[PDB]
Symmetry: D2
Subunit: 337 residues, 4 copies
């Protein structure tokens, strides 16, 4: 007997989630969708031969008693609104990054979930389900390299559109690093600082590219993260953790090697979409499985969404301040441990 | 509306397939099982909370009109029998390696499928679905390295039981290499030769370990394959294809690197089961998807099973002959292209 | 007819240079030595069966008309003194790092060389002769990756003695990085900043280990350099240069790979001495060759020594300031380009 | 007091040896040369400003009492002649591969050295001095992987001239593999077999390219060696040794990695000359050093030359026989152990 899922926002990524749930995962179906372009959400129901109702807005869909759970996968700032409603309507919500665009927005959502007794909210930080990052986690949990002291990491992308703005680099992009990193090391951010290198010839005039972002935790781990979204060569995620007694490092995506015209090579991806395909699948399936076999959700929490929001804010602050901004977090409610 | 699958042989591997279909894949269910230890097949229905009928034998299960398709995943020599029945009962059959234990056994099965008009039989040669081997295929199809001339490859395993016999090395083990290799290069085997190196201290007395197996295709590709099932260090599959203008090579499984006590390392698997987990999933899902969206099966064919059987036989021949045995194949029926 | 070399300071490293010149290189001999422990200098002349005069002090040795060139390889702060003397005595001087321990000390030496018409002083920054760094140089000179924007690099060492102090990390250690990096990118340092991560359990109480050192050039290249001298795992130099259109990276030292007990590994060196052995050889041979076939020295210059001194000072400043210190350099005299 | 060396054969490779001895190594000089084109030998003496006598033939040069040692570096079949003379004239001889072009030719040379009491003859098999091969040796000597069982290896070259003939592949090319491999594993060859794969489009019509060469030792190690001299992509030497409990593998030559246009790459050499440059240097220096500090030569022996000759012959035999030829070696004289 399969979980009945309603999708809010049938854009490019909500279309990807509809396809995995329909044709790749196990034990769930899409019974309802609503988009803001109601005509698009009516061409998607046909496209994937869904057996689903098409609502004009969220409220209508959240009223429907079929739907046990919703995917929030619409425009970014329209998230907070739909999550609060779904919590009050007491449905399970899988909400794509970001949880909300402001730090208080995330706080409002925590307070609601806190009331409604159990965990309803999983945030779509898929990196925690990628086998690379899972292995790093395992080695750290095993004290393979003793105490983490520094982290170097990088998030690069071939080119961006006319729409990509200086803040998006730390809000839409460095956001997964921010989530995954503190999950691995089990610590909280303290300060953030932003440093701009010589600007790239591949960056448009309004964009500042690359950027380095230093970040210290409370324990004193020092992270420096490079964000270069016009690197031209490929899409590439690198993460090295230096510990007291050794170093561990994230793998490249699997690739056949080639020997030809003087070079020994492997392939680098050009498409951010392709990089985490497996972790999307495993993440959703875990929302599904965790609900039917526990009565609550298991992944990244509303709280983790809140931590991403505060730090993301401090970054955008140190971004035009040029100074060493501070990251101030409220006490972690007993609810979340 | 999901495909109704009956499993013949609820052993260790048929249990793995029941679990992927039940809890990982999409659009199919297990409605029927039969084992030879009928008590075991009645503890498996409970184990995975299946909603399935338990038959005493294949015939009973193949009569059941629920079941559209069957997994043949029982003892090895009990395959041919169950496949012929399922073809005549006109159900879709996914049959695990081997198709049958004798070369004529595979021929009998081809003749039956040939009659019944369309493709019912997929053979479980999962390597063709592994992303490594898929990439090699893609580069060869693109003429990246021109004409294949030689292949070097290796199939190693830490240790084997008291049950592992000299012939099993080319019958149960080198069998996937044999299937996958000719699929990649699109050619047929001509001769096989077997050469025994100094015998390993890790091999039991009745077993001959390692072995090298040279194999020539009709076009003149020269393959040498190493089979060392007591290599102790790990489970490891290596495949290098040398072409006219360059070389392509299979990847290692993804692993975090580590720097500690004087060494820079990655992990090697110890468990053959873990190596191809993803290709099992993708293989089954493709049996499922290909049936509901085409009315026939798509994978490795009954014919490919026949090619594996002939070559596997010539190998066991050159295995105790010590001579350069021959591989003689019947004409490839128009049915299969 | 071979170059006659006098060695000032017959310690451990001056002994290594006497051995290479005597038994490995071409076209030079040691005809004179002086140490501060004059007894040790005699034991050296005997040890390497030298045919050399033993002076009580530098002045005596610089008077000797045999010696065309001197190695300054004595205790650190005793360098400046011996280099000024050798310049005025008008001999060729190869001076090991540092050129002098203060920034003005290097300035005094530049002024002397400036007068004496030609280049007499090569500083022993051997990295410029290592084949790795030579290749990076070549790729940058060829615009392979366009404009350098950032550099990440690391200098790690297993453990240090009771004698290793917090400033030595940027004075004795990060000093080669400081020389080589601006040689590669052809730019000058502007600011330096020092950040202390959580302190290591492998570091003694008086030592601050690791450190991160951020450094910006005038053009805007942003360098972050990690110095971890108690990393325990090995001796390891890493340098990655991120450019506009691609990334280039320093190689590991050559090593046989090994597959054993679950791991695929290569070796990491435990001894800083072993890492640059080939660049020492090539460096000295180039002092020799460049003198006999040009009448002047070719390597890193007295000026480059001065640049290392100013930046080294700013680092030690930002080291206890905790602030973003500045690097102020005098105009580059026409003499040096 | 430096070793006085006479060079027989001032061709391209004898010119390289004259240059290293003159301008790179320590403790030796060229005091005498003779070529067959006596005019070329004069132009060489001038080219490298040598202080040397120019003889019309070997006999004259071997009479000269200056010369303690000779390099035999002339045209291939002219080696045996000059080595026998030098042994009887009782000079030290460094003889480039091959020692002689026939197996009995090597036998005549062994018998002469055997009489003259000590070791005069070093054969120029430089691989034993390359740091890669030295490391493999060390790991095998340490039983790191237990008992060697198989070896896979390859010798590839971009393209060859109109002058390169099918036999040269096993006589001029596979000859270093043949020497180095039995040195590593400390065993003797027993059989050889030659297998021709589909012929390459890069090979001329008179040449058979690639070839595989299987070789068994007495102990039962099974070696398969690939020789592809028109592989087009680069010059590339690969050697993998599979032992009982693990695998060891030769390194690639050091290279900077690059990330650009979709690929992560390293460089492959195009010039056989560049691959072993360091082992040539270390090899010669060891002829020199071993003579002045022992009164005999240390490297590969006249005997090792003989072993290469017998096996080289068996290969050329199995090369047009198509059969499994045999390698028959005379008893190893007590003189050589
Ligand atoms: N975790 C990740 O790596 C990742 C990757 C990509 C995108 N995302 C996130 O996914 C979201 C969507 O991404 P996208 O690039 O497909 O954007 P998109 O523009 O394709 O999706 C927005 C769609 O939702 C509709 N919409 C907006 N508000 C709505 C509302 N309140 N109710 C119903 N429909 C509404 C719009 O009409 C549009 O069709 C964003 O929040 C983005 O940050 C996360
Ligand atoms: N493609 C691969 O990499 C791969 C891997 C592992 C196993 N296999 C194949 O899978 C098959 C099973 O493997 P396994 O190791 O789990 O063996 P297993 O012993 O666990 O499975 C045999 C089971 O089937 C039952 N059985 C035998 N004949 C039967 C019949 N006619 N009808 C109903 N039940 C029957 C037995 O009682 C037993 O429970 C073998 O043929 C093997 O070659 C293939
Ligand atoms: N470039 C490099 O990779 C590198 C590596 C190691 C050391 N060094 C540098 O080289 C220098 C020498 O190192 P070391 O380890 O041989 O030193 P050391 O302490 O081992 O010995 C130096 C010797 O010179 C003597 N000496 C001191 N002052 C003298 C003077 N005025 N005149 C003559 N002799 C004098 C000392 O008594 C001692 O015997 C140091 O400055 C060091 O920092 C450079
Ligand atoms: N070990 C290695 O890596 C390696 C590499 C290249 C070549 N070699 C070998 O070294 C040898 C020389 O190679 P090369 O390319 O310099 O040869 P080359 O043909 O370029 O020149 C050899 C020179 O010696 C002269 N010569 C011939 N016979 C002579 C004799 N009896 N006495 C004096 N001079 C004589 C020739 O006229 C010529 O000028 C060859 O046997 C070759 O196979 C070994």
């Amino acid at each position: 007997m399969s979980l009945r899922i309603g999708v809010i926002g049938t854009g490019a990524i909500g279309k990807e989630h509809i396809n995995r749930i329909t044709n790749k995962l196990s034990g769930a179906e899409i019974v309802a969708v609503t988009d803001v372009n109601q005509e698009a959400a009516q061409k998607v129901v046909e496209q994937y031969q869904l057996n689903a109702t098409v609502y004009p807005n969220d409220d209508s869909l959240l009223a429907d008693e079929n739907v046990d759970a919703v995917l929030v996968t619409s425009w970014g700032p329209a998230h907070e609104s739909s999550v609060l409603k779904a919590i009050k309507a007491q449905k399970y919500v899988f909400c794509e990054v970001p949880l909300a665009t402001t730090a208080e927005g995330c706080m409002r959502i925590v307070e609601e979930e806190i009331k409604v007794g159990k965990r309803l909210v999983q945030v779509g930080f898929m990196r925690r389900y990628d086998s690379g990052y899972v292995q790093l986690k395992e080695a750290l949990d095993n004290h393979v390299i003793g105490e983490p002291l520094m982290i170097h990491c990088a998030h690069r992308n071939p080119t961006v559109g006319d729409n990509y703005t200086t803040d998006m680099a730390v809000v839409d992009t460095l956001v997964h690093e921010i989530d995954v990193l503190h999950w691995l090391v089990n610590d909280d951010y303290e300060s953030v600082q932003v440093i701009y290198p010589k600007k790239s010839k591949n960056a448009l005039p309004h964009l500042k590219d690359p950027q380095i972002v230093v970040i210290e935790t409370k324990g004193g781990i020092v992270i420096n993260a490079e964000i270069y979204v016009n690197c031209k060569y490929g899409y590439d995620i690198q993460c090295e953790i230096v510990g007291e007694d050794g170093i561990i490092k994230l793998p490249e995506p699997s690739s056949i090697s080639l020997r030809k015209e003087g070079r020994f090579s492997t392939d680098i991806l050009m498409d951010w979409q392709r990089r985490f395909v497996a972790a999307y699948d495993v993440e959703i399936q875990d929302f599904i499985d965790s609900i039917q076999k526990k009565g609550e959700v298991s992944g990244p929490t509303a709280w983790d969404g809140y931590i991403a929001a505060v730090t993301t804010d401090a970054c955008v602050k140190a971004q035009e301040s040029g100074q060493k901004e501070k990251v101030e977090l409220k006490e972690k409610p007993e609810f979340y441990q």
